[PDB]
Coordinates of C-alpha atoms in Angstrom, one line a residue:
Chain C
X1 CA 4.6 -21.2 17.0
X2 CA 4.5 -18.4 19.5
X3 CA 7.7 -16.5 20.8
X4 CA 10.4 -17.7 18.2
X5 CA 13.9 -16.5 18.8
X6 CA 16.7 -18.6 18.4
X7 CA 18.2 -19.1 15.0
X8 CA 21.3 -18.4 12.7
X9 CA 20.1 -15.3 10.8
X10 CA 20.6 -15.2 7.8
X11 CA 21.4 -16.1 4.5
X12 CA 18.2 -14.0 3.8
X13 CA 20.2 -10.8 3.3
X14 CA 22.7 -9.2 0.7
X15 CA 26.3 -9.2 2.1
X16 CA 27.2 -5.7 3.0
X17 CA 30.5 -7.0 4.0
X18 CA 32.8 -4.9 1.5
X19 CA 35.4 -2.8 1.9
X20 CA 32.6 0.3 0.5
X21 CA 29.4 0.4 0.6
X22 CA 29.0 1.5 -2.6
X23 CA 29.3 4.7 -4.7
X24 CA 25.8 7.4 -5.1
X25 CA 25.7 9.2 -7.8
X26 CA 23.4 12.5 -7.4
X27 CA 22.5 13.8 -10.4
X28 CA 20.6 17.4 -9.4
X29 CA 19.3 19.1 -12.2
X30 CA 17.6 22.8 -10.8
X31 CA 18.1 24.7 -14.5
X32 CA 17.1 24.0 -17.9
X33 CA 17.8 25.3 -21.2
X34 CA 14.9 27.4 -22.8
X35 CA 14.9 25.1 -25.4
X36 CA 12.8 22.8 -23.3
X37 CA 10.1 24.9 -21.8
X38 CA 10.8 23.7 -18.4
X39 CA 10.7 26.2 -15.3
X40 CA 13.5 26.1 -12.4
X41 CA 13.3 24.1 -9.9
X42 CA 13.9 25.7 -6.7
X43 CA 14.4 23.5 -3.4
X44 CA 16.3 20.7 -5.5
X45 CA 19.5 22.2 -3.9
X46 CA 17.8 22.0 -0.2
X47 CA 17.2 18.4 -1.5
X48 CA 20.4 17.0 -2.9
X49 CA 21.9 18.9 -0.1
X50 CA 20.3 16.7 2.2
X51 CA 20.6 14.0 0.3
X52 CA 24.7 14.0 0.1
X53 CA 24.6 14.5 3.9
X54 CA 22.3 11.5 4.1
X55 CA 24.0 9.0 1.9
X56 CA 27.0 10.5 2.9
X57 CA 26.3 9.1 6.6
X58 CA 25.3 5.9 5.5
X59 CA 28.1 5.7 3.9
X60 CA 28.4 6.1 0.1
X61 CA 31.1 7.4 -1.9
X62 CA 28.5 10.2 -2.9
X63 CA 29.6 13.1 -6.3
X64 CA 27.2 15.5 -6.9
X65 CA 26.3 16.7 -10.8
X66 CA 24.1 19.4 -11.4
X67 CA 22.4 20.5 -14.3
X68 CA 23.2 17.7 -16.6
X69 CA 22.3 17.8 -19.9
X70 CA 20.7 14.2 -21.3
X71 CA 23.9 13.6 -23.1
X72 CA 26.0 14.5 -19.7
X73 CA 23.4 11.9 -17.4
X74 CA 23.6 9.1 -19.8
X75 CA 27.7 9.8 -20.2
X76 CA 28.4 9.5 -15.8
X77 CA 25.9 6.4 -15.5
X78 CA 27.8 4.7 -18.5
X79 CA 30.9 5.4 -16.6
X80 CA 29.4 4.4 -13.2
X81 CA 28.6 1.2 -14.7
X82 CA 31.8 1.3 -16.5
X83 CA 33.6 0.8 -12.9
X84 CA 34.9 -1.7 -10.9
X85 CA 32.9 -2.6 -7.8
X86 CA 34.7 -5.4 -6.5
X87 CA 35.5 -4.5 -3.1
X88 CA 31.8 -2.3 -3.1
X89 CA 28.1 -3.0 -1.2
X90 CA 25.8 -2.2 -3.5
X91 CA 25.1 1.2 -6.1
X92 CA 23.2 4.0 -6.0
X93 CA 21.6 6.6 -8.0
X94 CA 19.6 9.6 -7.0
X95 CA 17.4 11.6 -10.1
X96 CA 16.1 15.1 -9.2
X97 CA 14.4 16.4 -12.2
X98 CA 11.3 17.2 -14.5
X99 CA 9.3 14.1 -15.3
X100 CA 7.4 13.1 -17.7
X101 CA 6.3 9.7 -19.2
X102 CA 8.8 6.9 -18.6
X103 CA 11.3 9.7 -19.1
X104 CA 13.3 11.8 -16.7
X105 CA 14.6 15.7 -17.8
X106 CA 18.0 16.8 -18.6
X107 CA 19.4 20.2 -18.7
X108 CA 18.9 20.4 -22.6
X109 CA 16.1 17.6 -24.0
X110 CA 14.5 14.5 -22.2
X111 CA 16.7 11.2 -22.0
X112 CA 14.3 7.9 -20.8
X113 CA 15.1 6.1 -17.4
X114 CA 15.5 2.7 -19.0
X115 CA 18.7 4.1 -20.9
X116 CA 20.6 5.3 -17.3
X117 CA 19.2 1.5 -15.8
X118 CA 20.5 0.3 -19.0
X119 CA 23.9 0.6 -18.4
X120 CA 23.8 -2.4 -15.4
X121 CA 21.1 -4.6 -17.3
X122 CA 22.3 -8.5 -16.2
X123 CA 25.2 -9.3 -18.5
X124 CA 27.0 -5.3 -18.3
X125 CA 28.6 -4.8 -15.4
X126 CA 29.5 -7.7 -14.0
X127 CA 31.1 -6.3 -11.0
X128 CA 28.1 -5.3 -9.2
X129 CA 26.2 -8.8 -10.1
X130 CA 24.5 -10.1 -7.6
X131 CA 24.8 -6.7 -5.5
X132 CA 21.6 -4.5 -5.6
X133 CA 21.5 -1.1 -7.7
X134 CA 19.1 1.2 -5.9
X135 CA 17.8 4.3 -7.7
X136 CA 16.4 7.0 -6.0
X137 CA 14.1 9.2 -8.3
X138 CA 12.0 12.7 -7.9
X139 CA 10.9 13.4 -11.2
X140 CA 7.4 15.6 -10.8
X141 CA 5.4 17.0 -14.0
X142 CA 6.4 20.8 -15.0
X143 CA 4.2 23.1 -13.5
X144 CA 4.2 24.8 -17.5
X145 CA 3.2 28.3 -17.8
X146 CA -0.1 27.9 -16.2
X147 CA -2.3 29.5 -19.5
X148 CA -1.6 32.7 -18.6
X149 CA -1.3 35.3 -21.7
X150 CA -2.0 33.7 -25.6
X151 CA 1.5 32.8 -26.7
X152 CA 2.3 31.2 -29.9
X153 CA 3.6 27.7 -29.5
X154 CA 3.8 23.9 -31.5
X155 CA 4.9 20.8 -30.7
X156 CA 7.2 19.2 -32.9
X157 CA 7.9 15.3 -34.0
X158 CA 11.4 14.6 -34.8
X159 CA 13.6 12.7 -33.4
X160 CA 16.5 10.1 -33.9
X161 CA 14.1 7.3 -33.5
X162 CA 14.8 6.0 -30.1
X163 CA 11.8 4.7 -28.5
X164 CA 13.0 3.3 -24.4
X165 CA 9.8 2.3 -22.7
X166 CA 10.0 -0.6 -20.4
X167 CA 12.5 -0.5 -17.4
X168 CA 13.2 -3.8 -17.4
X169 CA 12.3 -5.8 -14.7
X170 CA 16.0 -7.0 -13.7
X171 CA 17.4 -8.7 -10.5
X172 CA 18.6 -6.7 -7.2
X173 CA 17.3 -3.7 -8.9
X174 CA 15.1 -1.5 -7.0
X175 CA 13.2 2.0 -7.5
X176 CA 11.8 4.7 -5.5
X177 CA 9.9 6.9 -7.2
X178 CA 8.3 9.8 -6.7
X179 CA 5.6 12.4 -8.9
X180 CA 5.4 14.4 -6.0
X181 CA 6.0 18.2 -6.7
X182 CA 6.6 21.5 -4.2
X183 CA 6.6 24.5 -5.6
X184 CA 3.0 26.2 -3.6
X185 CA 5.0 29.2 -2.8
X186 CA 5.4 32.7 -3.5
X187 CA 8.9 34.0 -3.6
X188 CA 9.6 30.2 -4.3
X189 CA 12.0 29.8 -1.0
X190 CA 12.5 26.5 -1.7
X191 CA 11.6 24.3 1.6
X192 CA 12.4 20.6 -0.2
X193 CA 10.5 17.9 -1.6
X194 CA 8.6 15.7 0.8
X195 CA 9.7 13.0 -0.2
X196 CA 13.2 13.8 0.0
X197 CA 12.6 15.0 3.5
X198 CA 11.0 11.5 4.6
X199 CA 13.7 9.7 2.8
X200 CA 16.2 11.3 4.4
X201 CA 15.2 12.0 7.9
X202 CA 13.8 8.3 8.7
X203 CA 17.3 7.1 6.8
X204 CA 19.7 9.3 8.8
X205 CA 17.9 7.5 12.0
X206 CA 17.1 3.9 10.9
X207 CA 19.8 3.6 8.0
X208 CA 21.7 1.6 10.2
X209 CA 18.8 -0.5 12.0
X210 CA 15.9 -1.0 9.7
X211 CA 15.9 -3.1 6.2
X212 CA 15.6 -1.1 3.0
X213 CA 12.0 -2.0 2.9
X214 CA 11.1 -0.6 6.3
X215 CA 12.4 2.7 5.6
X216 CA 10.7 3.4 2.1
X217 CA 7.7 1.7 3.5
X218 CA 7.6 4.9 6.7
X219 CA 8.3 7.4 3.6
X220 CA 5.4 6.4 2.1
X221 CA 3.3 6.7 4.9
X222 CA 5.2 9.8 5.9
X223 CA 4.5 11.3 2.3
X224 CA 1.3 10.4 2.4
X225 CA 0.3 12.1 5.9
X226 CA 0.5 15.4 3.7
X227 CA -2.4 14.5 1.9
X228 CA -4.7 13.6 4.9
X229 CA -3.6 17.3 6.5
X230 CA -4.6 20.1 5.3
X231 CA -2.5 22.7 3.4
X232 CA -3.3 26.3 4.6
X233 CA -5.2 28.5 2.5
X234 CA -8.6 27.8 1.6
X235 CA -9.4 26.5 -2.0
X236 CA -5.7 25.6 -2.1
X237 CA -5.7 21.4 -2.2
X238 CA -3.7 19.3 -4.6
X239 CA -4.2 15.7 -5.5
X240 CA -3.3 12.9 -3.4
X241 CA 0.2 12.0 -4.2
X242 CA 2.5 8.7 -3.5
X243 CA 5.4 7.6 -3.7
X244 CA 6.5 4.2 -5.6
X245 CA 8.5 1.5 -4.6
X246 CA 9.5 -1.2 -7.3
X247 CA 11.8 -4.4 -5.9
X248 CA 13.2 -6.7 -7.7
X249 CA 15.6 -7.4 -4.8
X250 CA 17.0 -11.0 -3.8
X251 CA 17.6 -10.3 -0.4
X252 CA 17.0 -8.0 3.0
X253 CA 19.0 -4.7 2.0
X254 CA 21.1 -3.4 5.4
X255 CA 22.8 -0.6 5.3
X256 CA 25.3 -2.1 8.3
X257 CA 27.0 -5.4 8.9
X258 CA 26.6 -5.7 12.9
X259 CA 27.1 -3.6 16.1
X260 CA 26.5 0.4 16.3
X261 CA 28.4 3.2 14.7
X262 CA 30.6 5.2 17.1
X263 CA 29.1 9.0 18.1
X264 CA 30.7 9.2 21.7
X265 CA 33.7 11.2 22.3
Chain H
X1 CA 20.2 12.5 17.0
X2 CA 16.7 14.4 16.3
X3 CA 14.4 12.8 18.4
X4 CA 14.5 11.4 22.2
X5 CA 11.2 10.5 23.1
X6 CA 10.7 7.0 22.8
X7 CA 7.4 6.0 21.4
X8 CA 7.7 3.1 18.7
X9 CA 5.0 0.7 20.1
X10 CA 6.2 -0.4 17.0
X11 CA 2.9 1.6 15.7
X12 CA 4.1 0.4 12.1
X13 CA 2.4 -2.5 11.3
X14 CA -0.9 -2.3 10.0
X15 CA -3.6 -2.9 12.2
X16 CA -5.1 -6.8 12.4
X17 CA -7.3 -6.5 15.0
X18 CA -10.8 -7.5 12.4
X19 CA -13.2 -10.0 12.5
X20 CA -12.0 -11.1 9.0
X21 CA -9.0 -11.3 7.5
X22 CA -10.5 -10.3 4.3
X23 CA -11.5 -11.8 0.8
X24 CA -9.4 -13.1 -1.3
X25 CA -10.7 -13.5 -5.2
X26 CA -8.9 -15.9 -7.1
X27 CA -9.6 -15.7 -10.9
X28 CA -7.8 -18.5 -12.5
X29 CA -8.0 -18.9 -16.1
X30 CA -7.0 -21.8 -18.4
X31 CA -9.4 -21.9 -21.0
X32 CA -9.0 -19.1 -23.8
X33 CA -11.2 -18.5 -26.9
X34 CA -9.2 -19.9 -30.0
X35 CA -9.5 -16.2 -31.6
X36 CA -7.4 -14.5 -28.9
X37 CA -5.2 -16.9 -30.5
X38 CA -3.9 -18.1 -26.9
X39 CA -3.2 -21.4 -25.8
X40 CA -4.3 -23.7 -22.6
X42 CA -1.9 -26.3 -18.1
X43 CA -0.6 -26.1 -14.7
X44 CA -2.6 -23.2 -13.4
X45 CA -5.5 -25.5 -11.6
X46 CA -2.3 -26.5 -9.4
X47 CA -1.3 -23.4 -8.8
X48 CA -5.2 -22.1 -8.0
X49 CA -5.5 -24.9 -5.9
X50 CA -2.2 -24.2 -4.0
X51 CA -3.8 -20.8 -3.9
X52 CA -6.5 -21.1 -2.4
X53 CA -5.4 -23.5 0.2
X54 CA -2.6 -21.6 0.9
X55 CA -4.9 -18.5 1.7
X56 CA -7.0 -20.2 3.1
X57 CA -5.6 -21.4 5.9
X58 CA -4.0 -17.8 6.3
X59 CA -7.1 -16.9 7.4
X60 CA -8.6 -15.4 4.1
X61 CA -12.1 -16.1 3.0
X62 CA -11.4 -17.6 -0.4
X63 CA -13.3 -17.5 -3.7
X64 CA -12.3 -19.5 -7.0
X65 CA -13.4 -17.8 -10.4
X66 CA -12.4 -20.3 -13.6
X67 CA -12.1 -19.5 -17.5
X68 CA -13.6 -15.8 -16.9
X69 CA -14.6 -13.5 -19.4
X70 CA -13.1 -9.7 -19.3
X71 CA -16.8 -8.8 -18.5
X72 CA -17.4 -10.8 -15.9
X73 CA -13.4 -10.1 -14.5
X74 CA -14.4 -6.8 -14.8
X75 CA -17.6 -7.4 -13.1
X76 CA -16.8 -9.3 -10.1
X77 CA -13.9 -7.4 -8.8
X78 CA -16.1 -4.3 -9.2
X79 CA -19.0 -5.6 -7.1
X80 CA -16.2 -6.9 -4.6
X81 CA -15.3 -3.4 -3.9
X82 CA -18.4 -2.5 -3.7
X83 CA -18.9 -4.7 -0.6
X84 CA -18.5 -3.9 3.1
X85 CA -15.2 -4.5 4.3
X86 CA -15.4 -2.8 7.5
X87 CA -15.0 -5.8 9.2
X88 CA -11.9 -6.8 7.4
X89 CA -8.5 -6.7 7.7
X90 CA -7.1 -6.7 4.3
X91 CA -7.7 -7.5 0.9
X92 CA -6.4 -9.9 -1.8
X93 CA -6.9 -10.9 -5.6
X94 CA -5.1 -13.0 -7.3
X95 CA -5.1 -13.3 -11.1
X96 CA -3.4 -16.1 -13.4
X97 CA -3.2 -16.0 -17.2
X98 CA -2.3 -14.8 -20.2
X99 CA -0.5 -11.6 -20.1
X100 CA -0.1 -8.5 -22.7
X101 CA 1.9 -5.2 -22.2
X102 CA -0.2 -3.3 -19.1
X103 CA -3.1 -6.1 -20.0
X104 CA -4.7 -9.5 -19.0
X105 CA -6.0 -12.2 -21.0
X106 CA -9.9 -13.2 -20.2
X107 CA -11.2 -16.1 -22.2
X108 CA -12.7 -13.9 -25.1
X109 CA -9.9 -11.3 -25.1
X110 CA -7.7 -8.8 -23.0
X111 CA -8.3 -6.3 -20.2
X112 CA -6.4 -3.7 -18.5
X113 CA -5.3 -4.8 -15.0
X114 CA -5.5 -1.1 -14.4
X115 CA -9.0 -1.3 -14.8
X116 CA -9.3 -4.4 -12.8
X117 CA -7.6 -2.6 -9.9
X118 CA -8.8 0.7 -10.0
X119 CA -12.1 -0.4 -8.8
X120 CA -10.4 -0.2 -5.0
X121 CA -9.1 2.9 -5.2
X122 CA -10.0 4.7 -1.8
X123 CA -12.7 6.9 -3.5
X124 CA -14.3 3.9 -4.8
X125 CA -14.3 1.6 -1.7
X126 CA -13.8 3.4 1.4
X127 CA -14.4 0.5 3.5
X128 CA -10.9 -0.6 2.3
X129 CA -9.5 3.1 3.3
X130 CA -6.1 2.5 4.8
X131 CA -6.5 -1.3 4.5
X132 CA -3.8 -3.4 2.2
X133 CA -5.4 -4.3 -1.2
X134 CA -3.0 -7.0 -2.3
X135 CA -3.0 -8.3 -5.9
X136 CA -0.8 -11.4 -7.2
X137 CA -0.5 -11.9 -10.8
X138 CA 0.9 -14.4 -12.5
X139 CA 0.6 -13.3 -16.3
X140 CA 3.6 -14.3 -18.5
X141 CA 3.4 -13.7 -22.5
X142 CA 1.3 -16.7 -24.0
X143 CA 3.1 -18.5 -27.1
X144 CA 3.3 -21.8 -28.8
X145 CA 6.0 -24.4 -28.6
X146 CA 8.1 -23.9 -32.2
X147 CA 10.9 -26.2 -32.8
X148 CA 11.5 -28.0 -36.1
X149 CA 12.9 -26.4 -38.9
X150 CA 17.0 -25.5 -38.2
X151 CA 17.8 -21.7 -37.9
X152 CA 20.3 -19.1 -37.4
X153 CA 17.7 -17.5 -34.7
X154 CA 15.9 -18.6 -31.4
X155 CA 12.9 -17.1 -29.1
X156 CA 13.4 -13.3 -28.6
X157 CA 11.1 -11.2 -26.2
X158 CA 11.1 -7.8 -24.7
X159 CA 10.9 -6.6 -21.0
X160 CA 8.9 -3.4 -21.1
X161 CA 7.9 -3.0 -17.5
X162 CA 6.9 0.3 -15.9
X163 CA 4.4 0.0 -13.0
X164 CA 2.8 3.2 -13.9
X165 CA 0.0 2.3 -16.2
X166 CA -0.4 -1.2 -14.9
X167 CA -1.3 0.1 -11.2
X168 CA -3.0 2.4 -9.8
X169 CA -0.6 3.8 -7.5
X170 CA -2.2 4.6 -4.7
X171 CA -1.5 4.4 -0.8
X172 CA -1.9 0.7 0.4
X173 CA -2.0 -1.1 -2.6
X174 CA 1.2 -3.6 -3.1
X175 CA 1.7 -5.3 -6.7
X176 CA 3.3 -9.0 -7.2
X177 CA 3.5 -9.1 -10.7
X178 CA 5.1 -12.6 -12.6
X179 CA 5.4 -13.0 -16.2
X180 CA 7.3 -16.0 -16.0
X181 CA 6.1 -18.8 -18.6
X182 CA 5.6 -22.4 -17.5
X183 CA 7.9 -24.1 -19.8
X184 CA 8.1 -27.6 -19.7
X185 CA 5.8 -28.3 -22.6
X186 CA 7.2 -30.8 -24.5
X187 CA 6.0 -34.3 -22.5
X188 CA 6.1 -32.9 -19.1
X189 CA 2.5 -32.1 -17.7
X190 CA 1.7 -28.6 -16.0
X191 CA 3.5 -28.7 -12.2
X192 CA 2.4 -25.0 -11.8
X193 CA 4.1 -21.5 -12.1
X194 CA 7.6 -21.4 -10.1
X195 CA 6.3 -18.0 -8.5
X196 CA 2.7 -19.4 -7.4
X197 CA 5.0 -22.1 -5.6
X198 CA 7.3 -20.2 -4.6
X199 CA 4.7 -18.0 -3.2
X200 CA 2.5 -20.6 -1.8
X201 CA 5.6 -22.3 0.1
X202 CA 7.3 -19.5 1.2
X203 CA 3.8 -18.5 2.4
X204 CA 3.3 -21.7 4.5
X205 CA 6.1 -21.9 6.2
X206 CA 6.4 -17.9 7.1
X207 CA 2.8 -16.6 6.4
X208 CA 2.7 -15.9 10.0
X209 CA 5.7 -15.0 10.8
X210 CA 7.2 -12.8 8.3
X211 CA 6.2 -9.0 6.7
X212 CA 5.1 -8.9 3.3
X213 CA 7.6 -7.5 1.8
X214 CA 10.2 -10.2 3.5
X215 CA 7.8 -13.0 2.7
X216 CA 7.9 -11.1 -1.5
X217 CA 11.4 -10.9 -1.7
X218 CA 12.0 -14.6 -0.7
X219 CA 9.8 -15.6 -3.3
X220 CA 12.0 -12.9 -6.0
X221 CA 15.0 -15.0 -4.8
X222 CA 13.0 -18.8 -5.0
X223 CA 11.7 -17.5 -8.4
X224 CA 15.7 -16.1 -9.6
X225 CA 17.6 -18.9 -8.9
X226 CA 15.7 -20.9 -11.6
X227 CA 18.5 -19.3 -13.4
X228 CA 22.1 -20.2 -12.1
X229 CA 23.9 -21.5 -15.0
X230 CA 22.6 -24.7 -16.3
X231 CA 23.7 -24.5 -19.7
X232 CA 26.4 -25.8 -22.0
X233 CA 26.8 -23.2 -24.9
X234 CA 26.0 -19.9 -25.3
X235 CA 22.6 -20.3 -27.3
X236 CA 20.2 -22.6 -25.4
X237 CA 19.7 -21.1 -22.3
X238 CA 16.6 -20.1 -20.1
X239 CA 16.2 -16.4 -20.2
X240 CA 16.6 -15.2 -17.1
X241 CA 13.4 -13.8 -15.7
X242 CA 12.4 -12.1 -12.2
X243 CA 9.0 -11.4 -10.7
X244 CA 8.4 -7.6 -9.9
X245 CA 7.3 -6.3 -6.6
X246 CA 4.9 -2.5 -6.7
X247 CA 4.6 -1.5 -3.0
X248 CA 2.6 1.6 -2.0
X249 CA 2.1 0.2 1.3
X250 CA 2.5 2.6 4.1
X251 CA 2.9 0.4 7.0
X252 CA 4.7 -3.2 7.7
X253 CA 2.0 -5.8 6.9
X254 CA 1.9 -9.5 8.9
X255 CA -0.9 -11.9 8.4
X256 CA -0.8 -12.3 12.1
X257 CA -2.5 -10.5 14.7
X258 CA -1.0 -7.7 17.3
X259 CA -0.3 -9.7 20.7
X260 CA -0.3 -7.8 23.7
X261 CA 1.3 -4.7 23.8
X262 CA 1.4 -1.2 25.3
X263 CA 4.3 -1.6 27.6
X264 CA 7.3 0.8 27.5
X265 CA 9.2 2.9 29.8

């Protein structure tokens, strides 16, 4: 048919009527131990910065960690889970670290995504069934040492035999992630991630009006401008870059119920 | 605040405004080689839903059966190898046996990474900035056991990171199902609850409805195959979900852009 607009709608989207949207959990990890060979990572303040602004405004019961150690990340998501979220929206969790294969970098070692997901799998945490679990993650390679001068170095294998590869494919779960680095400066000023950026300034202007899908959708294409501009400097490119969005959601995700939010005096 | 300019058209939505909606390879598989070790029913329902159902969105439609990993390989490389300047989109749809980041052809396994790579921008410009859609239907072949009593049933794993099964690039959006058929005890094949629910869903919104709206109905059709029909806590369906990749970067309709340009 042509010009449809007259219908209930809907029971196509997950209830944000509770009495919180949800709590967001911002884990921002800028140093690491030597131990780990991992360099700082300036701008991730700029970044959670404006992230706890942004969530903030849409409404989540955001906290803040910083430099968490594996043991430290795996600890609060436990206790997250650990929660009641009766009278709560939906959950949250925002990653900014190191990254690497499946796994995502503490302050001391490496801890795997699928044990901080792990924590909500089906059955466990029953209070935020049905709900959707969003996490947020910005976990680029290390930019390592770059060659530079001859050191002496060796990997070593030994661990406490705890392979966690697979991410299960669960129910109102859904991930944004993103490889993309930033770190092409000098002094190292720190000017955020783009992705971060995109996330947050289309979500702190359609948060309210466009569906969960929209907005990651206009990140992605708003990330991925940057690598069909150029990027000052001659013989100074980098590799096309994108970020990822994985839904396993049920339902349209709103970040509102209906009506505006109140700005005027 | 930040902006007061007023100039969503809504420019968002990927441009439909071809000669073509596109292709739209479906490989559908049923026949394996007995040393895979894989099994046979249902799937010619579910490519014929398919392919109908496609069709009459508007794409141009092509049916591949019992395929080798050579020729899957082959085919979808040629395919991107095409001109698809004069199409909208793009879409392949795979059903069969599925393995880890792998597919089953009827003499042995493939990675779908390979299967998809072949579109990445570099490789098929004419598809630059143009959806390349892939639906899989792929659950973990296995034969029906029942007959001795034991302490132990079925146990499987969900390792799922879309990372080395896509090749995440802009405009490329994954479906992926593992979801088995079941029902193979008497029952004959009535096809793959995500091809249906796909297919339906697809009917009755195809034109109507974004992508990603159209996706997550089908998560939800697909989910509730998994209320709580059971008695004790043993003999249950395990609860499964299909898995959506997106690395679209604009809203996608199978319709085309009315008339617009018209804002003050």
């Amino acid at each position: 048919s042509i010009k449809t607009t007259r219908d209930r709608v809907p029971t196509y989207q997950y209830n944000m009527n509770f009495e919180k949207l949800g709590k967001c959990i911002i884990i921002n990890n800028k140093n690491f131990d030597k131990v780990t060979g991992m360099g700082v990572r300036n701008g991730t303040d700029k970044d959670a910065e404006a992230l706890f602004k942004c969530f903030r405004s849409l409404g989540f019961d955001v906290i803040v960690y910083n430099d968490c150690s594996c043991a430290k990340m795996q600890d609060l998501l436990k206790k997250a889970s650990e929660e009641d979220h009766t009278n709560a929206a939906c959950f949250a969790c925002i990653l900014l670290s190191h990254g690497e294969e499946n796994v995502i970098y503490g302050k001391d070692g490496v801890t795997p995504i699928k044990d901080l997901t792990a924590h909500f799998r089906g059955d466990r945490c029953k209070t935020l069934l049905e709900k959707p679990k969003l996490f947020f993650i910005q976990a680029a390679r290390g930019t390592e040492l770059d060659d530079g001068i001859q050191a002496d170095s060796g990997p070593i294998n030994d661990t406490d035999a705890n392979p966690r590869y697979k991410i299960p494919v669960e129910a109102d779960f859904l991930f944004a992630y993103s490889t993309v680095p930033g770190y092409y400066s000098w002094r190292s000023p720190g000017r955020g991630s783009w992705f971060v950026q995109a996330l947050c300034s289309i979500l702190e202007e359609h948060g309210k009006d466009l569906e969960i899908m929209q907005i990651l959708t206009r990140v992605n294409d708003r990330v991925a401008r940057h690598f069909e501009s150029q990027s000052d400097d001659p013989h100074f490119h980098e590799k096309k870059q994108i970020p990822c969005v994985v839904s396993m959601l049920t339902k349209e995700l709103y970040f509102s119920q209906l009506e505006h939010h109140h700005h005027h005096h």
